[PDB]
Amino acid sequence: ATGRIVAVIGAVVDVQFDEGLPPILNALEVQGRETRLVLEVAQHLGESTVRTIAMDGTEGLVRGQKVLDSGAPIKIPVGPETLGRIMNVIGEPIDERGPIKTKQFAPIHAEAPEFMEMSVEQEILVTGIKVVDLLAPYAKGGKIGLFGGAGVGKTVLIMELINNVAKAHGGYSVFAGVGERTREGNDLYHEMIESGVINLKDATSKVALVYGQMNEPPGARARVALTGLTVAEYFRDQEGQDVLLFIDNIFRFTQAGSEVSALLGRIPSAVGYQPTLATDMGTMQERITTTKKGSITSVQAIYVPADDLTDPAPATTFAHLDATTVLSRAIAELGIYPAVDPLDSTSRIMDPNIVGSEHYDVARGVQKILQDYKSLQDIIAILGMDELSEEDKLTVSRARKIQRFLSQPFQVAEVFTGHMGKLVPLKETIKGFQQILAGEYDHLPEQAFYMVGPIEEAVAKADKLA
Amino acid sequence: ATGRIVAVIGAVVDVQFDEGLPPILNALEVQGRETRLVLEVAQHLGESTVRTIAMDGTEGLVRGQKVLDSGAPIKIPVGPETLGRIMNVIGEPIDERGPIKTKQFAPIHAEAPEFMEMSVEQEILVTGIKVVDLLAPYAKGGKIGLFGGAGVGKTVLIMELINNVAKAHGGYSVFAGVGERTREGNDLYHEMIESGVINLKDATSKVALVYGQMNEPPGARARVALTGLTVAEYFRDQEGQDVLLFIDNIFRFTQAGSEVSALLGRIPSAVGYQPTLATDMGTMQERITTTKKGSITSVQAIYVPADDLTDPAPATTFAHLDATTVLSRAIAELGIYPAVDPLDSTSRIMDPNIVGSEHYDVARGVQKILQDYKSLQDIISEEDKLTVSRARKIQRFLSQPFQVAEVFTGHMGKLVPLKETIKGFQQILAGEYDHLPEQAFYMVGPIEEAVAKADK
Amino acid sequence: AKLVRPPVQVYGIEGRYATALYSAASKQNKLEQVEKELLRVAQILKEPKVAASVLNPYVKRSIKVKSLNDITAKERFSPLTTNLINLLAENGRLSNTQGVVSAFSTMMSVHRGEVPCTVTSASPLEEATLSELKTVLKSFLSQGQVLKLEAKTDPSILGGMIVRIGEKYVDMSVKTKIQKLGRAMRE
Amino acid sequence: DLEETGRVLSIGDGIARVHGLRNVQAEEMVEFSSGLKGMSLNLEPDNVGVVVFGNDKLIKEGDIVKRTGAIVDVPVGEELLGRVVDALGNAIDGKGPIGSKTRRRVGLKAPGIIPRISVREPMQTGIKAVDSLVPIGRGQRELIIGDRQTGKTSIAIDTIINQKRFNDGSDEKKKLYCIYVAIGQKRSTVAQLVKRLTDADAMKYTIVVSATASDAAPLQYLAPYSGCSMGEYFRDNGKHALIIYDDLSKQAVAYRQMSLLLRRPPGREAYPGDVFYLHSRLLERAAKMNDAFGGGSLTALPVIETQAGDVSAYIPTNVISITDGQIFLETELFYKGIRPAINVGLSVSRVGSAAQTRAMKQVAGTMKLELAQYREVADAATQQLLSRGVRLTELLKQGQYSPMAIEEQVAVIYAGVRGYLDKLEPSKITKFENAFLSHVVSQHQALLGTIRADGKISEQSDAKLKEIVTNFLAGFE
Amino acid sequence: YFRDNGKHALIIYDDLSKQAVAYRQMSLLLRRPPGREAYPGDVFYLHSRLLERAAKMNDAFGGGSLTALPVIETQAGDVSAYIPTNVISITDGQIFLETELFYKGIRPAINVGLSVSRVGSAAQTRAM
Ligand SMILES: Nc1ncnc2c1ncn2[C@@H]1O[C@H](COP(=O)(O)OP(=O)(O)OP(=O)(O)O)[C@@H](O)[C@H]1O
Ligand SMILES: Nc1ncnc2c1ncn2[C@@H]1O[C@H](COP(=O)(O)OP(=O)(O)O)[C@@H](O)[C@H]1O
Ligand SMILES: [Mg+2]
Numbered sequence A: 001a002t003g004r005i006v007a008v009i010g011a012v013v014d015v016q017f018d019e020g021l022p023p024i025l026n027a028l029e030v031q032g033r034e035t036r037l038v039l040e041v042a043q044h045l046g047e048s049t050v051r052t053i054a055m056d057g058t059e060g061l062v063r064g065q066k067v068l069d070s071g072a073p074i075k076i077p078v079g080p081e082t083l084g085r086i087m088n089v090i091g092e093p094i095d096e097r098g099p100i101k102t103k104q105f106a107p108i109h110a111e112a113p114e115f116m117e118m119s120v121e122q123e124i125l126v127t128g129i130k131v132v133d134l135l136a137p138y139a140k141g142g143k144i145g146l147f148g149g150a151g152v153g154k155t156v157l158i159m160e161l162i163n164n165v166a167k168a169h170g171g172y173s174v175f176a177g178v179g180e181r182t183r184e185g186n187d188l189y190h191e192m193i194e195s196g197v198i199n200l201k202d203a204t205s206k207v208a209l210v211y212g213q214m215n216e217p218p219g220a221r222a223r224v225a226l227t228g229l230t231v232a233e234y235f236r237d238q239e240g241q242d243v244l245l246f247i248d249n250i251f252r253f254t255q256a257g258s259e260v261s262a263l264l265g266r267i268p269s270a271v272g273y274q275p276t277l278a279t280d281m282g283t284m285q286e287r288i289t290t291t292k293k294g295s296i297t298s299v300q301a302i303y304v305p306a307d308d309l310t311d312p313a314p315a316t317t318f319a320h321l322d323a324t325t326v327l328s329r330a331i332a333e334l335g336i337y338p339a340v341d342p343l344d345s346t347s348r349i350m351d352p353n354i355v356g357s358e359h360y361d362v363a364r365g366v367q368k369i370l371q372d373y374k375s376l377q378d379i380i381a382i383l384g385m386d387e388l389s390e391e392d393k394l395t396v397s398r399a400r401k402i403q404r405f406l407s408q409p410f411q412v413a414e415v416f417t418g419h420m421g422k423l424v425p426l427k428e429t430i431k432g433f434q435q436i437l438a439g440e441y442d443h444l445p446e447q448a449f450y451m452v453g454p455i456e457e458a459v460a461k462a463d464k465l466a
Numbered sequence B: 001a002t003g004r005i006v007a008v009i010g011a012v013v014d015v016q017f018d019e020g021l022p023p024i025l026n027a028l029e030v031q032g033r034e035t036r037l038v039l040e041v042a043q044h045l046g047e048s049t050v051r052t053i054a055m056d057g058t059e060g061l062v063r064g065q066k067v068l069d070s071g072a073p074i075k076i077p078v079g080p081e082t083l084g085r086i087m088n089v090i091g092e093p094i095d096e097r098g099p100i101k102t103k104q105f106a107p108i109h110a111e112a113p114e115f116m117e118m119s120v121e122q123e124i125l126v127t128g129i130k131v132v133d134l135l136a137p138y139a140k141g142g143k144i145g146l147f148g149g150a151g152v153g154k155t156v157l158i159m160e161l162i163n164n165v166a167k168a169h170g171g172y173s174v175f176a177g178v179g180e181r182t183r184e185g186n187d188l189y190h191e192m193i194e195s196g197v198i199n200l201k202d203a204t205s206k207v208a209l210v211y212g213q214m215n216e217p218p219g220a221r222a223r224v225a226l227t228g229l230t231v232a233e234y235f236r237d238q239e240g241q242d243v244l245l246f247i248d249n250i251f252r253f254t255q256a257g258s259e260v261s262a263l264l265g266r267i268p269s270a271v272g273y274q275p276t277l278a279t280d281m282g283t284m285q286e287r288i289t290t291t292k293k294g295s296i297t298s299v300q301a302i303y304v305p306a307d308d309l310t311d312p313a314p315a316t317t318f319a320h321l322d323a324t325t326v327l328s329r330a331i332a333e334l335g336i337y338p339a340v341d342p343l344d345s346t347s348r349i350m351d352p353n354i355v356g357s358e359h360y361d362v363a364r365g366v367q368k369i370l371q372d373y374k375s376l377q378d379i380i381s382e383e384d385k386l387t388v389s390r391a392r393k394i395q396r397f398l399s400q401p402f403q404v405a406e407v408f409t410g411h412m413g414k415l416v417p418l419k420e421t422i423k424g425f426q427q428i429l430a431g432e433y434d435h436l437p438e439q440a441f442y443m444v445g446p447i448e449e450a451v452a453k454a455d456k
Numbered sequence C: 001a002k003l004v005r006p007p008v009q010v011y012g013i014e015g016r017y018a019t020a021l022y023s024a025a026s027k028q029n030k031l032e033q034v035e036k037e038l039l040r041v042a043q044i045l046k047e048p049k050v051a052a053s054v055l056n057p058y059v060k061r062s063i064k065v066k067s068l069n070d071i072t073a074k075e076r077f078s079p080l081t082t083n084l085i086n087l088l089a090e091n092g093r094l095s096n097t098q099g100v101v102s103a104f105s106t107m108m109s110v111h112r113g114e115v116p117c118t119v120t121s122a123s124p125l126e127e128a129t130l131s132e133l134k135t136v137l138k139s140f141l142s143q144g145q146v147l148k149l150e151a152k153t154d155p156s157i158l159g160g161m162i163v164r165i166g167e168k169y170v171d172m173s174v175k176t177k178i179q180k181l182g183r184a185m186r187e
Numbered sequence D: 001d002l003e004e005t006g007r008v009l010s011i012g013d014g015i016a017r018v019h020g021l022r023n024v025q026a027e028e029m030v031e032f033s034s035g036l037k038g039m040s041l042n043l044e045p046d047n048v049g050v051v052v053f054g055n056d057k058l059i060k061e062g063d064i065v066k067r068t069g070a071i072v073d074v075p076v077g078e079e080l081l082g083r084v085v086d087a088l089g090n091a092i093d094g095k096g097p098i099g100s101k102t103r104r105r106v107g108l109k110a111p112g113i114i115p116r117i118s119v120r121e122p123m124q125t126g127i128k129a130v131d132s133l134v135p136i137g138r139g140q141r142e143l144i145i146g147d148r149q150t151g152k153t154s155i156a157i158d159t160i161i162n163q164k165r166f167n168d169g170s171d172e173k174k175k176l177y178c179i180y181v182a183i184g185q186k187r188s189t190v191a192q193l194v195k196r197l198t199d200a201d202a203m204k205y206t207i208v209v210s211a212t213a214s215d216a217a218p219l220q221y222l223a224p225y226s227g228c229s230m231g232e233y234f235r236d237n238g239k240h241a242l243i244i245y246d247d248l249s250k251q252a253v254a255y256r257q258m259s260l261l262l263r264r265p266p267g268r269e270a271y272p273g274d275v276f277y278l279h280s281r282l283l284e285r286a287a288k289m290n291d292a293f294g295g296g297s298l299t300a301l302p303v304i305e306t307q308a309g310d311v312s313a314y315i316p317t318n319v320i321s322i323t324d325g326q327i328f329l330e331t332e333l334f335y336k337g338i339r340p341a342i343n344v345g346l347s348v349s350r351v352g353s354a355a356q357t358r359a360m361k362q363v364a365g366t367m368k369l370e371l372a373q374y375r376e377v378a379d380a381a382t383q384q385l386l387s388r389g390v391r392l393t394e395l396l397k398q399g400q401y402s403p404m405a406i407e408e409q410v411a412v413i414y415a416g417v418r419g420y421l422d423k424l425e426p427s428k429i430t431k432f433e434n435a436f437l438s439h440v441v442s443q444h445q446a447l448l449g450t451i452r453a454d455g456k457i458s459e460q461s462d463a464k465l466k467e468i469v470t471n472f473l474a475g476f477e
Numbered sequence E: 001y002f003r004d005n006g007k008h009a010l011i012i013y014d015d016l017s018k019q020a021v022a023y024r025q026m027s028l029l030l031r032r033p034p035g036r037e038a039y040p041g042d043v044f045y046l047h048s049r050l051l052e053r054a055a056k057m058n059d060a061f062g063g064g065s066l067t068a069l070p071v072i073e074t075q076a077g078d079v080s081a082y083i084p085t086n087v088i089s090i091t092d093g094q095i096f097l098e099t100e101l102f103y104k105g106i107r108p109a110i111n112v113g114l115s116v117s118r119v120g121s122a123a124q125t126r127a128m
């Protein structure tokens, strides 16, 4: 089928087909372009006219330009031949190493796994970070979401999880860059090249990369998440492997939907987002799941606009995640890093029948003492510190010690800090927090715990304090 | 060009033309009315129809009524014959003293001066007021946010600025009453008539008034500031002077803009102001500047809505303010006149690279000693009492007898130039006058008169 | 491009196309020709076959306008009429055609000076007094007009007569009279 | 003709609905009969929406609108150096016509992943606080954020002035061409800034694009892209370019105006939904190109004004999420006399520590550690920590329009963190520094020259520095 | 069914905020006029004609009942939003859960101050 272009509004193109109106979600090609330009069909406006979201820039389009139907959704090459490459949203390799000579192509739009395929296994995933493993431990196959405003440490945390988990990983691994800094993508590509994960000379690469970054028009930023999903879905279903899927950032998918929704002629919902925010996020996030035919452990960075944690996009994402880690700016500005909020992060495996009664009691004690300190905050701020009860001063001191201890230096943060990155095993964390709770260290200054590894390094520093 | 009114909705009038559409921002005279009613074009709606905002009430408008195009924006009469007269947004004398017999007119919608016409160095404007010329100097060609309202002698400060600028720099002034209470407009008119600023009997009046009152359609209240600015622009360009342009109020200018926008059906921006808030304020304020002919120095009374400086209207007018003059009431109760708060009044030319290191040092010293005086008075010794004495003498020396009040207290008028102010405060801080009584500086001109009064 | 406006104005898309055709015809002096051909094409587009085809929301716009060209060109249409027809069709404004024509007719109802007036009375009238009344309410008119009488009969007015001529309106019925009585005696 | 010419159907709300132009392209620069120019934004089935780059007053209904057939572009090249152009590349300094011979599309895309390379070369700002604790490398996007009247434009001007010591040398690998885009500032401010740069003799390598407050909102919305294209020219030819968007808050405001007059759904604070893509597509074009593309780079210093020091607003957080760091200019620090009022506790440069020189790193890692301790304390040792910190903050204060070479800065920080000032009076440190500098510029030209050439501090140079500062310190008050 | 066939049921909608969001999407797409938070005008009708179906029949109708436990998710404890206040005004009393009590060791984190049961003691055994 061959149509023509009748309207061009930013990133939204209305094309009028003569005969053979393409179904919704099909991919159309624009004839007369230097580089391929794909339009995805979104609506049928009647009069045999369809509305479409462009997948690249739309400058230079003229009314009356030809458009050819491909008769299928945007198909991307999938298979083990995609590892160690970098494809954009429509599946073209953008690493300048030649085409992706794989056998099969898969469509980026697919139905979510049914109910009978869902798996309910909840083994813990030890990351090596103290606050995460103590208060919001991750699970294999679960979905992890790192919330946080701008400049609180989402990207550093994801690079740390790639350093600690995507390196000791057995299965494959996918990284979908959805609207983020391009230099971050270049740095990740080269850091993965040097570390031997991506091997440019042979076929032993262990990572496939997809990248539609914050310089791309909203069509690409809206569908590159689905492209990454498609790659991970192949590695899960068609090979029964154990896949990791690092998405960064997933808020840009919703934001791109919002940028395009104004032009699709729709009444804006609350805040300003599209009316179809929740269902769009649902049809995307339901594909990212561990079935009984495979397993996908997903870590998704989630921006938070203006630090508003009640913004419809993150408040809608919360329901989709098995474990949430909510970085906070009030904590990063205390110098603590990672800036995890210990009183806002949760996990579905923080249950005494899973992580063991000991870990559970320790975690709950830490949360309780920090919450009590947070309650005392205003009295301490106005009526001084020496107007408290002796028990209250005890809790304040212990809680400040716990605050410092929850911080930890990262191996990827040693470039702009200098300190040596630590990897605290689970037992060391549980033991250290047991001991701090029990007041076994009420003689060291709280300053001894700031940015250390396990508790041994804490007391070693405290001795070095003199 | 002759069109006809096809729609009337409150203050928004849609006028259809048969041929020769008027460009946007043109003035249209509604034919067949007792009083002149001018419509200003705002959009070209299509089908040869334009949309307009009315400068006066639209009662008694009939669909199909003829409307004449003027081929130019609202043209007001400019010239020295404007001095002492009052005119509304379209230049009609509303003082009941006959026509304003000027020789030339000017459109109120002009463009800001070119980049090649700007002045490349900031220079201070000497107002002859000690506290203003010491602690918060006025940049020649800059906008000055004059805070404070009633019972702090604001209008006296206005008349004294007019008088001083007319005597020292030889440049007149313009007072644009954007959204004024008519009662206060008349009060100010009569106070200006008494203090000699306005002179109803000769050709020696200093200020030209332009009034758009609180009870006018929002188009008039939005354009009156441009009318006053056009009068001042004439004085700057064609006469080559250093004009003052008082805008009271400026928040009512912003409000008139917001109302005009909401009437035209534009979607409101954040908070509630027009989507074109910053651009409205920009096209207004970018005409108040210094050129290679003269300058225009604007003093704008700022009202802060709900005492919130992050509100879009103050936040947008602050970007254009080069100075600030805060009139406090506590400083008034302490008998200080002008009641300019010495610490809160800031400036943007308080910079050695501009006002010279000498002036900057003296002003910084005065600010420092006054801050230390407040910190000491928090408590209530060895030299703390010496600082307290010098600071009391500084406070007393900041006051000044304004000439515009000679009719009240008989005291003479003191226009203290900058050199003598600098030197006087330098000598007071150096301790040269640590022996004189502190009352020897109350309501004095230069320091010479301070020691003269100290004799008695 | 300057347009000549008709002395009476109609609005909506109907009125827009009507005044477009009025200007297009008064610029080549074919008012009566296009008027009669408009009435006839309105009769044509209301016979059940094409009157049913024109509003089917799926028949392609190109094929619909081409078939409509086929149908109108056989009646020896002047260029202006088929121009308006194709302008309405390529714009999807066909279901409004008759309305436009109606509007256009009213425009001619002002070009010929036809002033429509109503005289409503209690009972039907005999044409001697009706003719002298035509003479009476014809005396108001200025130089060069013709008048269209559309009298209706309503016993609810219990007598008198109501003359609504264009915009002028005299109410000499006994009903408004007795309402005047009630309101004046009560006050 | 209705394919290379149109008629304005309706001008208003800063948008011209034009009839015709069946052959116009999306984002094509059409020209109105009034001499104005505009961008073909919307292409609708019957009319074309055109954004007007100027005052709508100049446009009536029925005016013929020709098309130029070229997507919106700006003239680039070395001919722009020392010129003050507007957002359309037209000379507004009355120095004749811009002799440019090549043009570049303002709406290009940023280089992808492969054409880039990690930031490695220093971009010396000449400011002690920046160069020591917030190092900026060529190819970075560092955000200068802070309230009104806190010293942002002054920092940018000091950088542009400092680049003079390189742009007169020999090796074309260190020279840096600067571009200062002005977005909604008072025009008198831009005139005075151009003069200040002319006096410092830094115009010979600077371009100034001015879309001031009296220019239509589309001009303020386009000016950043004209600047970024003029910079991309240098970046794509192996050269190095710095660019300062002063500021992006006012471009965001202009875009919000353009979006509300187009009736688009306003989001938070009434900003359009794509107020993020607006800045992202612009700050992503500042990149460091690898050697297979030329080795050139483009550095962006976007300025952002916060309201009441609130950094968690909408546009500030957007640009924080786009750039590679920030420079917090507090106002309480600016009030107490600290200038530049850099909150070194909150300022950060993620990709800069790999861009410091060896010597500056040798002194600055230290200095950062001690300043961190001094900030976290505010005993017998903590009194020493507080005193050293107070001395160091007094050392970070700097004048204006006087940026220091890298060797002078490393010498000063050396004298500071090596304990040699732990006995002097804080309030005198400043003067000491000044005096110290003069001495080292007089009797130690060879030491400065070798610290520069080596780019490091060898043990011989370290001992020479220690002896020199001790000789000067003894012969002091 | 169970309510009308003499048996007792217990239904739990989990939750109603998401049903209201789905209905808001359907409305805004159907071009219906939006209200507060862009919700349609008759979302109260939507929740009320559902929560009213939870009744306790008398012995002339079998005696069966139907208890409902609708769930509602507030944003930062704002119970003055549109859907929260609608469902609060509809039901017969609330069970407020807080996170400050949840991290103070009180689990279930029921805030007894704000929790009410308009049925009250009539819905208890004698001993309790
Ligand atoms: N390091 C400094 N030393 C001395 N004076 C300084 C210093 N920095 C700024 N100033 C002065 O303080 C004022 C700050 O204005 P500046 O333009 O530099 O900052 P800004 O953020 O651009 O202000 P604005 O919001 O008005 O644009 C200037 O007058 C400047 O002369
Ligand atoms: N583990 C950490 N240690 C020290 N600083 C950190 C750490 N994590 C984040 N940061 C700070 O956050 C900055 C970058 O964090 P980033 O993840 O890139 O923010 P964003 O959420 O926008 O992606 C770093 O420059 C650093 O200052
Ligand atoms: Mg991120």
Ligand SMILES: [Mg+2]
Binding pocket: D153, D185, D246, D247
């Ligand atoms: Mg600035």
